[PDB]
Amino acid sequence: GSDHMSSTSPNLQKAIDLASKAAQEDKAGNYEEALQLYQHAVQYFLHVVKYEAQGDKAKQSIRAKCTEYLDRAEKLKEYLK
d(CA 48, CA 41): 11
Count the neighbouring beta carbons within 10 Å of the beta carbon of residue 80: 15
Contact 19, 65 (CB under 8 A): yes
What are the structural domains, with CATH classification, of the chain? Answer: 8-81 (1.20.58.80)
What is the DSSP code string of 51-80? Answer: HS--TGGGGHHHHHHHHHHHHHHHHHTTT-
Position 15: which residue type? A
Q: How far is CA 49 from CA 13, 39, 42, in A?
A: 13, 15, 10
* Residue 47 burial by Cβ neighbours in a 10 Å radius (0-12, 13-18, 19+): middle
d(CA 74, CA 65): 15
Q: How far is CA 35 from CA 13, 28, 59, 73, 79, in A?
A: 20, 13, 25, 5, 11
